[PDB]
């Protein structure tokens, strides 16, 4: 057994500047043949892992020379010299000196970009869902930065808390933004006892929330 240790996160990195990801091993990966058997893999959001670096410092075919790696038998550093939006993902270290083959826990690269307000869209229940006896009200809070955000629901003006489920995307590979969906799920019966439905998005880009509403 070898334990590969890396930090779950790194400091957000501005586009066009350098990132540095560290790893260490519980045992030397420097072989008697002179090779340090340390590998780096990248897993971009929604994708499989792909080989970036092998034998400590050698770039895999197609990998840009913005990527470089160095290290001893036990301490290693991946450098990305001029980070692009496409580089976000989880970077894993691994050894090739024994079985079991073991991996680090992965370090997520985050891109720091300019603050962006969300674009908010509210959606009434579909007639299909209503036919089935259900009523989900959906609010998208799209393409904002930074990741922190809050959503509040109101029904006929009063704050509603329960029945709400939230989900957040990973950082986007093209525009370095985040998005969130908030879904308020009611029975048809309860939905049709109220007329006005509102979602309010609060983000650091304004001291006022962005408010979207419809009337049933």
């Amino acid at each position: 057994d070898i334990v590969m240790t890396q930090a779950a996160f790194s400091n957000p990195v501005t586009l066009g500047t350098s990132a540095s990801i560290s790893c260490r091993s519980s045992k030397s990966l420097l072989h008697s043949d002179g090779i340090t058997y340390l590998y780096w893999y990248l897993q971009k959001p929604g994708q499989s892992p792909h080989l970036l670096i092998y034998h400590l410092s050698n770039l895999a075919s197609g990998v840009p020379d913005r990527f470089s790696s160095s290290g001893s038998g036990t301490d290693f550093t991946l450098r990305i010299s001029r980070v692009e939006a496409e580089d976000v993902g989880i970077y894993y270290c691994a050894h090739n000196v024994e079985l079991p083959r073991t991996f680090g826990g992965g370090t997520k690269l985050e891109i720091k970009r300019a603050d962006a307000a969300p674009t908010v869209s509210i959606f009434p229940p579909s007639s299909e869902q209503l036919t089935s006896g259900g009523a989900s009200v959906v609010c998208f809070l799209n393409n904002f930065y930074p990741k922190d955000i809050n959503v509040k629901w109101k029904i006929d003006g009063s704050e509603r808390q329960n029945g709400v489920l939230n989900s957040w995307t990973d950082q986007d590979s093209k525009d370095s933004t985040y998005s969130m969906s908030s879904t308020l799920t009611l029975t048809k019966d309860e939905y049709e006892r109220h007329n006005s439905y509102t979602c309010e998005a609060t983000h650091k880009t304004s001291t006022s929330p962005i408010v979207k509403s419809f009337n049933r």
Partner: protein
């Protein structure tokens, strides 16, 4: 070039068995070591089994976490790798990848070990009450995953799909698409949802309200 493609995943009950496989093209399969690596949120990437070559008498190796329960095998004539999995537990849930050490990974096949029953999704259009944002709500399914595309995968820019959230043994997710208002509703926007576990394929056209 090299293509690694897994199949056979699905749902099975605790204590049950499943056999998954993958076929490799773009190299001479019989000359490569083959392994299975699984991924879950709580445990990360975990190598579980490996098989060597004919010349090594197809020597096999297993993680301690699964030895006794998994059997790895290969058919060099079909370029196909297998993993037979017995007495599966819920902790064995995850995405199983073929990994040809050290250079190649497959696409993954999802294996869910659970006493909950497979349930197909209900797909609902999200249409509004320069640009317009539409969506699809995919509700009430089990197990993961689903795939959501727009206009059969053609409409790819301005799309994101939110991670599924589990409540009460069922998953819900939604997908967002943003297009110029000159393009919808003058031309069609359709979300395509596939839940292989229930063998369901649904197209839902987004029509203005």
């Amino acid at each position: 070039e090299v293509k690694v493609e897994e199949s056979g995943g699905g749902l099975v009950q605790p204590g049950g068995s499943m056999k998954i496989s993958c076929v490799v093209s773009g190299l001479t399969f019989s000359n490569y070591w083959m392994s299975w690596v699984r991924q879950s949120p709580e445990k990360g990437l975990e190598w579980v089994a490996e098989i060597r070559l004919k010349s090594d008498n197809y020597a096999t190796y297993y993680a301690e976490s699964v030895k006794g329960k998994f059997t790895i095998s290969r058919d060099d004539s079909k370029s196909r790798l297998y993993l037979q999995m017995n007495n599966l537990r819920t902790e064995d849930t995850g995405i199983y990848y073929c990994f040809l050490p050290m250079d190649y990974w497959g696409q993954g096949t999802s294996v869910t070990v659970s006493s909950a029953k497979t349930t197909p999704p209900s797909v609902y259009p999200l249409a509004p009450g320069s640009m317009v944002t539409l969506g699809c709500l995919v509700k009430g399914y089990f197990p993961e995953p689903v795939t959501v595309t727009w206009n059969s995968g053609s409409l790819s820019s301005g799309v994101h799909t939110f991670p599924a959230v589990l409540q009460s043994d069922l998953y819900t997710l939604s997908s967002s698409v943003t297009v110029p208002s000159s393009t919808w509703p003058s031309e069609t926007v359709t979300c395509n949802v596939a839940h292989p576990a229930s063998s369901t394929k649904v197209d839902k056209k987004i029509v203005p309200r």
